[PDB]
Design an enzyme around this catalytic site. Structure first.
Site, PDB file in Angstrom:
ATOM      1  N   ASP B  13       1.103  -1.106  -0.177  1.00 22.92           N
ATOM      2  CA  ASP B  13       0.249  -0.138   0.387  1.00 22.92           C
ATOM      3  C   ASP B  13       0.549   1.524   0.202  1.00 22.92           C
ATOM      4  O   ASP B  13       0.726   2.323   0.731  1.00 22.92           O
ATOM      5  CB  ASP B  13      -0.798   0.162   1.549  1.00 22.92           C
ATOM      6  N   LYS B  16       1.780   2.323  -4.870  1.00 23.75           N
ATOM      7  CA  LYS B  16       2.946   2.166  -6.882  1.00 23.75           C
ATOM      8  C   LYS B  16       2.766   2.594  -7.861  1.00 23.75           C
ATOM      9  O   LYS B  16       3.005   2.651  -8.522  1.00 23.75           O
ATOM     10  CB  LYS B  16       3.706   1.473  -6.236  1.00 23.75           C
ATOM     11  N   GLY B  40      -3.069  -5.623  -7.453  1.00 23.42           N
ATOM     12  CA  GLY B  40      -4.487  -4.836  -7.365  1.00 23.42           C
ATOM     13  C   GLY B  40      -3.971  -3.511  -8.371  1.00 23.42           C
ATOM     14  O   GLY B  40      -3.089  -3.131  -7.214  1.00 23.42           O
ATOM     15  N   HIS B  41      -4.059  -3.830  -9.288  1.00 28.62           N
ATOM     16  CA  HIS B  41      -3.238  -1.918  -9.954  1.00 28.62           C
ATOM     17  C   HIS B  41      -5.446  -1.102 -10.371  1.00 28.62           C
ATOM     18  O   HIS B  41      -5.460  -2.545 -11.669  1.00 28.62           O
ATOM     19  CB  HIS B  41      -2.555  -2.527 -11.326  1.00 28.62           C
ATOM     20  N   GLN B 224       3.971  -7.243  -4.030  1.00 30.83           N
ATOM     21  CA  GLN B 224       3.694  -7.112  -2.321  1.00 30.83           C
ATOM     22  C   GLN B 224       4.796  -6.153  -2.039  1.00 30.83           C
ATOM     23  O   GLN B 224       5.770  -4.700  -2.606  1.00 30.83           O
ATOM     24  CB  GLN B 224       3.678  -8.243  -2.274  1.00 30.83           C
TER      25      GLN B 224
END
Ligand SMILES: Nc1nc2c(ncn2[C@@H]2O[C@H](COP(=O)(O)OP(=O)(O)NP(=O)(O)O)[C@@H](O)[C@H]2O)c(=O)[nH]1
Lengths: 431, 431
Positions: B13, B16, B40-41, B224
């Site tokens: 988180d 990025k 997740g993007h 991650q």
């Protein structure tokens, strides 16, 4: 550079121990970063011959600190046996050897699974799987295994152990129909050494970072062949871990940009142990000759390894995966006396297509025809030669050609089992 | 440098996504090399908001090619879901995406194993019950799993599937007392999209080497947080795979020495989702302020998103593991309005020693007290600022103490969520 990596660029047995031993004379640290108790390094412990499978040969050197990074799976049973054998021989092991807290532990049930699997999976034939390395790695990724650091808190160790073992005993009895492994015994065997094991624990990453900064000579040694890499080797004929130089960061904690020099141990010809594609393999007199002059035998239930010419295509793949800096050619002398020497320069595909890259995306190695290049051999011995002038022109041309086909310089040449028989053209550390 | 690695340096988180989108304007190749379908993007296309967890963000760009390296565990199901979403919003994914035949496959039984495991002993606990990433990794290490490259030989695929599905079903039924997984179905599900998959297949490391010769811009994308790395993170509170820059080599086949620049994404303050050590955690109104003013309320991805001061001691470990080249400080604006600001510069150990390196990944973490160095804050706004002169002396002072404590410069600074709310002091590609 200062951070040097030394690994086998083919399918194991490149003859890396002598090179490793010679480079350890100038190194401050020697770090294992992959595999387990299968390093296979035979040493002369004062007249008496001894092999080490876990502890690095750097342990014999007084001013060297041997390190076992998080990438090595550690059987406590294996370490204690080696520790004792060495200390029995005067070597103060417990003060020159350091471990990571992240090393995965290999316990009885781990070996039990292997023994169980070989019976069923393989068969009643040379099924040497007694080790437990893979199962240890498996439990690691499944986030259910134990680590050295777990030994620091005993209460939890016992609970953690109990749980992973009931899960493993289930498979042992109800699926393999093997005996279960006793819990209390594993716990007691492990607690018996918990204080020894954790006394050698250090913050490896930080340590190596401090060395880097001070400019100390650090040698990272890989134990298995490049083409046996679980990911980039020839699936499924690959080992349980990553063998390429890229495995140095993960298995030791040092950042990737910190690898200065990658020394690739290259044997003058090729060999393979067991199943797997081997395009240059020889099933004739010349093969038998390489095996004999090279003593390519097991030294343990040896069935005699598979021989074949040097595979330039295969080696180009290893240059890529490891970002090789230079080569260290070995066993050049084994070829002394061949009227002609061959080297595969490309693979010819069943469709006619010729390539400089090894097979991918299925379309297996099943039909690659090796395109060779024939070189005249040499008669004049190369054994013992300590200078490029003692090397016949033929020998030189051959070496010369390898360099051209790979684009990587042979920085070291080995011409005998003893350390004096070595040519250093560049030197990994000071260049 | 041409080869850029980008990843979050804390526990995820880090903000990025924006940086990756930015850096993707110059990248020719964008590569995923670790983890699975947990990256997740979020993005906007056909006016809709779409989230990608597998396919590389660079898929939006036309002259960019996206690659999923052998380090990614791949689920066909999840690949088809995203693929379709993009095809629907007019993006020719089939054209721009490439995949390694070495990527392990995640099939329904893997998800069953995962789900059974956490939705079991200690339901309300920490283990699995999800995506199936650990089981696929495990099958890969055990060498019993299937790779994208098996889809070529459809016959061998169906029997292979039966041997492995027999092994897991036994486990599911007998040990977990859970529904078995229908083989016919899985087989039918994979055949339906095998041809689609095999067409995107390419030799990835061979391709990355050519790119390296002709000087193309390669962006390697981390998924991650660094401190969640399986091996070097805050174990046991760790994720499935390796999350540090060390995996780019094993995960894509790129040589370690060819990594030019590692960009560590760094949030101006700390957060963490869920259970686990967190030395600089706040338990006052400030932690509530950083959460509300930072939209960290289980917003991007959370549930238990704790907040705290930035931890240079932890950040330094991150520097060390990834060979960080430069930092990209994100969410500077969140601290707008704070009276004072804090940085953790050392950990006081329950015994009494004050250290500056991350205590062993299993020590008195929950029992360590962070030492802070206080600094004046800024009433002025940082938000929107697009030039470092426009930033207050208080802000550009804090920035410098991070530089000074980590020993790494901050080459990019993010001042808001908009792409234009960014300052690029250097640019990883020109460096
Ligand atoms: N105020 C502010 N918001 C930011 C900044 N950078 C990103 N954001 C916002 O904060 C969140 C950052 O998340 P995002 O950019 O999706 O990256 P992420 O979720 O951390 N990436 P991953 O989960 O893969 O690590 C988003 O909701 C984004 O709009 C910044 O510098 N300032």
């Amino acid at each position: 550079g200062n951070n040097v990596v030394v690994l086998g660029t083919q399918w194991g047995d490149e003859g890396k121990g002598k090179i490793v031993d010679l480079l350890t004379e100038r190194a401050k640290y020697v770090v294992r970063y992959q595999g387990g108790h299968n390093a296979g390094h035979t040493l002369v412990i004062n007249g008496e011959k001894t092999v080490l499978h876990l502890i690095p040969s750097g342990i014999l050197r007084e001013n060297v600190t041997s390190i076992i990074g998080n990438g090595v799976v550690l059987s406590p049973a294996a370490l204690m046996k080696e520790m004792k054998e060495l200390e029995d021989r005067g070597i103060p092991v417990r003060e020159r050897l350091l471990l990571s807290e992240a090393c995965p532990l290999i316990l009885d049930y781990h070996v039990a699974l292997d023994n169980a699997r070989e019976k069923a999976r393989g068969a009643k034939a040379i099924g040497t799987t007694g080790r437990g390395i893979g199962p240890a790695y498996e439990d690691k990724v499944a986030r259910r295994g134990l680590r050295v650091g777990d030994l620091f808190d005993k209460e939890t160790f016992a609970e953690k152990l109990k749980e992973v073992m009931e899960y493993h005993n289930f498979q042992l009895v109800n699926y393999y129909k093997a005996e279960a492994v006793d819990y209390q015994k594993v716990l007691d065997d492990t607690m018996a050494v918990a204080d020894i094991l954790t006394s050698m624990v250090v913050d490896v990453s930080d340590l190596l970072d401090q060395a880097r900064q001070r400019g100390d000579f650090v040698m990272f040694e890989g134990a298995q062949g490049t083409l046996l890499d679980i990911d980039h080797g020839t699936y499924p004929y690959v080992t349980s871990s990553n063998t390429t130089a890229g495995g140095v960061a993960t298995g030791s904690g040092l950042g990737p940009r910190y690898v200065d020099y990658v020394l690739g141990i290259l044997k003058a010809y090729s060999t393979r142990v067991g199943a797997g594609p081997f395009p240059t393999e020889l099933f004739d007199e010349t093969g038998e000759f390489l095996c004999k002059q090279g003593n390519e035998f097991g030294a343990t239930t040896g069935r005699r390894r598979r021989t074949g010419w040097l595979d330039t295509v295969a080696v180009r793949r290893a240059v890529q995966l490891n970002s090789l800096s230079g080569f260290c050619l070995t066993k050049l002398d084994v070829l002394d006396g061949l009227k002609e020497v061959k080297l595969c320069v490309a693979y010819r595909m069943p469709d006619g297509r010729e390539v400089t890259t090894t097979p991918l995306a299925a379309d297996d190695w099943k039909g690659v025809e090796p395109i060779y290049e024939t070189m005249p051999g040499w008669s004049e011995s190369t054994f013992g030669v300590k200078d490029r002038s003692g090397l016949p022109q033929a020998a030189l041309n051959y070496i010369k050609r390898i360099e051209e086909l790979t684009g990587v310089p042979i920085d070291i040449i080995s011409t005998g089992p003893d350390r004096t028989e070595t040519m250093i053209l560049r030197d990994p550390f000071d260049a």
